[PDB]
Write a protein that binds this ligand. Structure first.
Ligand SMILES: *[B]([O])([O])C1=[C]C2=C([C]=[C][C]=[C]2)S1
Length: 261
């Protein structure tokens, strides 16, 4: 059975909607499944906010070390790193790190506030040639993931192209590109997702995301041992608001599309 048949069967049994885009950077060939369809990004949008600050840092050498005050009122829901710093400060670099590696919601909101609101993240993405991405809200409401709601969504192909440009391509100057890559590789939340569908020795940098409607996402850059990198985005969402998140489906999808490398 083709790779297309297998994803279709995986999607059907799962009872949800699956979106996959794999780019093989060796020859720019692509494996696509519902890749032009919009999905709620949830926490995968944090990469774009962190990337926007890195871009700023290319022309402002003091920026990443700028300190930001964390107060009890800044805290939203789920703040594993920021709660450790109430009444203190975190630099913009520390916020970038926490947001990506721990998916800290307070850190995300701080970064968006620094940039001037969700619309500035959207403008940064456009500046990269990404015409799909839109961020509309802050944490935690950007995670509602209501079916058919276009707010805070992108498509798997658009997000694959953009993640490729950010980590392996021309989006960021080298020092900032390397920082983004260091952050993604140190991610702590993605063991059960894309990483679980791959050979154990491959190196992966990824950002997970989860939200309502059992929306379960992961976007990853993958460095095989003896091949050029792959970029892989897997988005998955379900029709009932209180559906369980399904990291195992992303892992199942990663295993299907990388069988052959
Ligand atoms: B992200 O990984 O999609 C996250 C979203 C939420 C978290 C905690 C609480 C509410 C939403 S992490």
């Amino acid at each position: 059975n083709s790779v297309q048949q297998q994803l279709e069967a995986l999607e059907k049994s799962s009872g949800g909607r699956l979106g996959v885009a794999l780019i093989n950077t060796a020859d720019n060939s692509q494996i696509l499944y519902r890749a032009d369809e919009r999905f709620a990004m949830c926490s995968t949008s944090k990469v774009m906010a962190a990337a926007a600050v890195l871009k700023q840092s290319e022309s402002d050498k003091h920026l990443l070390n700028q300190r930001v005050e964390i107060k009890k009122s800044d805290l939203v829901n789920y703040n594993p790193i920021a709660e450790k710093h109430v009444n203190g400060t975190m630099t913009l670099a520390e916020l970038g790190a926490a947001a990506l590696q721990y998916s800290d919601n307070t850190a995300m909101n701080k970064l968006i506030a620094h940039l001037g609101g969700p619309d500035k993240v959207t403008a940064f993405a456009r500046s990269l040639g990404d015409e799909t991405f839109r961020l509309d809200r802050t944490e935690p409401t950007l995670n509602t993931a209501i079916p058919g709601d276009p707010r805070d969504t992108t498509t798997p192909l658009a997000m694959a192209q953009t993640l490729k440009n950010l980590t392996l391509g021309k989006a960021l100057a080298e020092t900032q590109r390397a920082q983004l890559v260091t952050w993604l590789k140190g991610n702590t939340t993605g063991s059960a997702s894309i990483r679980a569908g791959l050979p154990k020795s491959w190196v992966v940098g990824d950002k997970t995301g989860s939200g309502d409607y059992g929306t379960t996402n992961d976007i990853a850059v993958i460095w095989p041992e003896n091949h050029a990198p792959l970029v892989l985005v897997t988005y998955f969402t379900q029709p009932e608001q209180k559906a369980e998140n399904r990291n195992d489906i992303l892992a199942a999808a990663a295993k299907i599309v990388t069988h052959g490398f």
